[PDB]
Amino acid sequence: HITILTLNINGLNSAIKRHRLASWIKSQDPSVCCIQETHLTCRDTHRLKIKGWRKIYQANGKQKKAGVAILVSDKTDFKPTKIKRDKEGHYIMVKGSIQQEELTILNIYAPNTGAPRFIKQVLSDLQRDLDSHTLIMGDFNTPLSTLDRSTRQKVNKDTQELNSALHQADLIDIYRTLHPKSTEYTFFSAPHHTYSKIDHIVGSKALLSKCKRTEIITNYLSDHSAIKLELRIKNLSTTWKLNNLLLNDYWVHNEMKAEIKMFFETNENKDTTYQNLWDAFKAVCRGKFIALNAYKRKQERSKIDTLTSQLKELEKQEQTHSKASRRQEITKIRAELKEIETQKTLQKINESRSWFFERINKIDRPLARLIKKKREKNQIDTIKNDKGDITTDPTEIQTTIREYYKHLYANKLENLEEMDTFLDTYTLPRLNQEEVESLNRPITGSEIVAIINSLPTKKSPGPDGFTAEFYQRYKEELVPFLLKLFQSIEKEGILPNSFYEASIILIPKPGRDTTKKENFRPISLMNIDAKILNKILANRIQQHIKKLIHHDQVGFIPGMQGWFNIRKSINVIQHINRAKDKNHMIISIDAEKAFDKIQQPFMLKTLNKLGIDGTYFKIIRAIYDKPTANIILNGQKLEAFPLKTGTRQGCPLSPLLFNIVLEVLARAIRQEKEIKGIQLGKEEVKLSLFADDMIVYLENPIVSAQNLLKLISNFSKVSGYKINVQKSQAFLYTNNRQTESQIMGELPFTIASKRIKYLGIQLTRDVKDLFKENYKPLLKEIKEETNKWKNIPCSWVGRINIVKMAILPKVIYRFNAIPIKLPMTFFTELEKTTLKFIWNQKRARIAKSILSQKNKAGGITLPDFKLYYKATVTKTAWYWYQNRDIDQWNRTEPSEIMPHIYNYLIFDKPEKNKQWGKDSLFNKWCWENWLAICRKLKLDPFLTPYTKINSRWIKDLNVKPKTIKTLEENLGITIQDIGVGKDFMSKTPKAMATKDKIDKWDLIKLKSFCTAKETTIRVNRQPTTWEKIFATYSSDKGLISRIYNELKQIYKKKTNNPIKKWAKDMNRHFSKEDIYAAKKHMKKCSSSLAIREMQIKTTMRYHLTPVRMAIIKKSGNNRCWRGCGEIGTLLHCWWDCKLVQPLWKSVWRFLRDLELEIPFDPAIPLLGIYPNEYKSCCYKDTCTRMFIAALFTIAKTWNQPKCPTMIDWIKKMWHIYTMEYYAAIKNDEFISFVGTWMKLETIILSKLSQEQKTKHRIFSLIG
DNA sequence: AGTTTTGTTTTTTTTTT
C-alpha cells in the first residue's frame, strides 16, 4: 500500500520551520506529501529540501504568498509524465505512474474569497487531464456538506454548483464516503468559536475500492490538521548496521560489557565447537544492540509524549462543548510544547556549527569537499542488454548484472597434471627450516591487540554490520575469546560460517561508459573479524617476501619506490638512442582483470613448491574452500553466488599472493636465454614490474618477441592469467622502414610513435622530449585548475592550504620521477600562477618574504617549490653512500669512460678527470647540486669522519683487498672506526688484537696515512646536521622532508618586521622577549583558524587606511573615513578614533568587574604584549577572548561613519562561547572550559535585559 | 632555574596498482 498525506503548513520561509516540517514528514513517512501555503517565492524553491524526499514538485509566485508542493519519498518509484504548475502558485498537477499503475494528483490551495467558484474553474481548465485515476487534495477553504461544520449550516449555492461539477467529473469526497457520519474538523475559527472541515481529499469513484483507510492528523506546525489516505497498490530491503554514535553513551556501554561477559560465561561448554559459538555470540550481540537503541529513543521522547497525551485527553472533549478551563490550558500547553521542539532543534544546529568551526581552512574533510565535486550517487537506472537494447526494468537489470558476475567467477580449472609439469620446468626459490618455522609459529594475544589498535577508522562495515570501532572499544573483553577462536582454527583449518560472506558494490571505472556492464569494478566488503585473521597471516609472510620476490618487482613491496622503474626505463631508452645499430623494442603489457582470473588451485600448488606447508598452508587452504559474495544494487541485497576463481579484491592478503604467483612467470622469462635482453656494460636488463603492470626491453625483436608470446601462452593455460595484445603498446627501433614493416606485420602490438603513458608519466620515444611532454603540460593544467577555483569562498589562509593539499603532491611526484635540469622560467610561472590565486588576483597584503618562516605569521607558511626541487635532486646521494645491490636503476646511465665512479663520489677524495658523466641525464646534475650546498656551508666533503674504509683514500695506498675486508669485518666501515693520530688502533682491545691479523707491509702503509696531522684534523672535526642526514640514517623514510628543512635554514633571508613599525607608531621600544611574546600569542591565542586569522591580520598590519589611499591615489585627502576630521593613521583607526573609544572603555569596565587590574595600553589588546607585572597572570585566556571579540566588532564596520555598539560585541563574544562549549564536552575538556568562561558568563548575564536575552537566545550552558 | 630543541605519536590528504 501507498500513503498520501496533505497539509497546509502556513509558511516555510524560516529555516527552523523547514526543519520542524522535515522532522514531522520523516515521522509520518508518507509515500507522497501535498503541502499548501509554502509562501516560498519562485526564487526560494531551492530552500525546500527534505532528507528522504528528494523528488519535489512546486508551483510558486513572485511573492511570499500561496505556494504548493508535492513531495515523493525516495522509497517510491513515481515516474512523472506531466507537471502543470499554476503561474500564481494556487495549484500543481502531476501525472505519472507507480509500479505500472497510472495516478494523477492535483494539489490545490483555494483563495479565502470565492473558493468554490475558483475550484470549479480549475476543474474545467484541467478537464482534459482529470482521468479516472485522479486524486484531488488540499485546502479548499470551504465545507462540502453540512457535517463539515459544527454549526451544521447548509452549504451555499457556489458550493452546490461545485458538488455538481465534482459529480459531473465522476469525482467523490473519499473521506465523507468512508466516514459518512464523521463530525471531525481540520480548522478552528476563533472569531465565531466554530470548527470546520475545509481540507479535503477528493478522487475518482473508480479508485474508491482501493481506499483502505483515511484519517485526520492534528499537529503543532500549523493551524490546520492534516489528512492521510492509504491506497491499495501492488508491490510486484533493510539490513542492520551499527551506529558508532551509540557506543559513546555511558549507560549503553556499561550494559554491553555485562552482557558480553554473561554470554560466554553461560554458553562456554564442550557441547559446541568454538567456531559455531562465535557466530551465535554475534547474533545475540546484534539483537541486544537493537533493543538498547529502541529503548533509548523511546525513553528520550517520554516527556513530549506525556504532554501530547495530556492535550489529546482534552482536545477531543472540545468537540462536544467548550469549557474555559480546558480552552485556556490547551492554548498554554500547545505553545509550550513548541518550545521544547524548538530548543532541541537549535541544539542540533549549534552542534553542527561547532564541529565545522574547528575544521575551517584546515586540511581535513571539509576543505577537500570544497574543491571536489559533489558526490554522484551509486545507482543504475538503465543498462545495455546483450540484444543491444537499452533497458530500464529493475528486475531485468538485476538479472543481467547478477548473471554477468555469477558467470565470470564460475570457471575453475581441472588440469592439475599440467600445473605440475610447468612448475617443474623452472628453478624457483624456497624457504629454509628457520623461515618455515617462523610462519607456522603459534598465535599470541599481543599479536592480536597490535592489529586491532591499527585498524583504520570510519570505514564501512561488512555484511554482519559490526565496525572496527566496536572491537577497539571492547578489546579488553574480546581478545581472550578471539584468541580461543584462532587457536581452534590452528588445530582444525575450519572457519566460522560467516567468515566466507562478503558484500559487493559496483564502481564505474574512470573514463568509461556507464551504459556497459563490462566497465564496472567490484569492491568487496568483508567482516572485521575475518580481516583480522587475514591481517595476521599477511604480516607473517611479509617478513620473508624479499627472499621470494626479485628486485624487478616494486609494487606492494615494503621499502621500494615506484620511481625506480621510471628512471631505469628512461636510461634504457637513452642507450638505444645513442646506439649506432638499431634493432631493439620496448613493450608495455597489462593483465586484464588480474586479481579475478587467478586460478586458485594453481596458486595453492605454487606455495607448496616454495616450501610453504603446515598450519600456515592449511589455514590458507581453508580460506579458499567456499567463499561467496552478495551483490548490493540500488540499495537492495541480491542472491549470493560462489567465487570459484581469483582473489578477494578487498582482502589484505590478496596483494602478496598475487605477486607470488606472478613471480613464477618473471623467473621463467629471466631464465629463458632465447629471449635476448639489452646489455648495458656489465648490466643485462629484461623486465620491470609494478603489481600487474609489466614492461619488457628486448633486443633482436623478430626472434625475441615471438619466444615471449609462446612462454606467456603456456603460462596462461595453467594459471588463467591473460593479456590484451592490442591494448599493449610498443616502441620499435630499426635501421630501415622495410624491416619495420616486416616486424609490424608479424606482431600484434600497437606501435606508439611519440609517447607511452606509464605509471603516471609520459615516456617519450626520444629522451630529448622529456621536459616538453611531462613538465610543459603540468603547468598548463595547474593554470586551468586554479582558474576554476578563482571564486571559491575562503580566505587567503584557506587558499594557501588548498595549494599544499591539491597542487603540492603532484608536483613533488613529478620532480621525484624525472629530476632533469629545469629552466628558471618554470619556477617563475609556477610562483606567479599560484600567488595570483592566493591573493584573489589583487596585490598581496603580506609579502611572501614574511610568510617564508614558521616562526613568523603564527604558523602560516607559503610553500616554496625551488627548495623542494633542490631537496629532491640532492636526495640521490643517499643511495650513493648507502651502497646496495638492489639499486640497478643507479647503474644504467652511460658509462663510456668508467662505470664505478658513483660509489666513490660521496665523502671521498676528488678526481682529476672531469669528462665523466658527459651525457648523464640525472646523476651529473645531482653532483653539481651536492657540491654547491657544501661550499655554501664551507665544508670539505672530501675527507670527513664518515669517510668509508673502502675509499679511494685507502685505495691510493697500495693495500691488498683482503686487508680492507679484514678491517671492515672486525672494526667497522669508516676510517674513524679504525682510529687516527694517537688512537690509530689502540681505540679498543679488539682492534689491538686485530692489528696482527693483517699484512705487516700494509700495516706500515696505513700507519703513515692515519698519523698525518692533516688526516687527524679533518677526521676529528664534529659532524654537521647536513652530514648526518646522508651518513647516519640507514632508512630513506621521510628523506625529502629532512633535506627541505635544512635548505630552509641555509637559504634564510632577512625581512622587514611589522612589529617594529608598531613600535614606531607608538613611542616605545619592544625588547626581544616582548617581540617573542607577540609571536607566541599570535600562534597560541586559539585552536581555530577562524579566530587566529583575525589576530594575525591585526599584528601584520593587513588593513588599508586613508593615509595609504591618499599616497596611492596621489592625493592629499588623508582624513579619517569616519568623519572625525583627524588624519587616518593605523593606530588612529583601532585605538584613538573618538567613535571607537566608547567600546574600549566598555571593555575595561568588564575587566574591572572581573576584579582585574590592567593599564589602558593599546599594545595589550592589539598585540598581546603585557608589562612585566602581568606576565605571570593566569587570566590571559579570558582576556584573549574578550579582546578578539572587540577586534571583530570594529573591523566589521571599518569605514562606516558610526560607532560600534556594545551589544554587537556581546553577541560575537557569546557566539564563541557557544562554539567552544560543544567542542569541550566532545573532547572531554569541560574542566578547562568552565575555568575559562565561568566568571565572564556570570557578568554578561548580569547586564542584559530579559527582553534582550530572549530576543537573542542568550542563556547559560554551564548551569 | 628557564626556554628552546629533538624525537615519537596521532591525525589529515594525494600518488601508483
Add this chain to the structure above:
DNA sequence: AAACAAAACT
C-alpha cells in the same frame, strides 16, 4: 601539522 616529554644551552 600538533602535542607531549626529555635534554641541553642561556
Add this chain to the structure above:
RNA sequence: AAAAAAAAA
C-alpha cells in the same frame, strides 16, 4: 566506497 605500498603536511 574496500585493499596494499609510497610521499607530504
Add this chain to the structure above:
DNA sequence: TTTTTTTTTTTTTTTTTTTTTATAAA
C-alpha cells in the same frame, strides 16, 4: 700536463616603480 686568465652564469643587494577604492560573512 698543469696553472693562470677570461668568460659566463647565478645569486645577492639596492634602487626604482606601481598600487586600490573597507571589511567580515559566505
Add this chain to the structure above:
DNA sequence: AAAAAAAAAAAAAAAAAAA
C-alpha cells in the same frame, strides 16, 4: 607606504692558452 621587479656587482667553475 609597502611589495615586487629590474639592474649591477661579486665570485666561482669551466675552457683555452701559456709555461
Add this chain to the structure above:
DNA sequence: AAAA
C-alpha cells in the same frame, strides 16, 4: 558552510 565545506560530513557523516
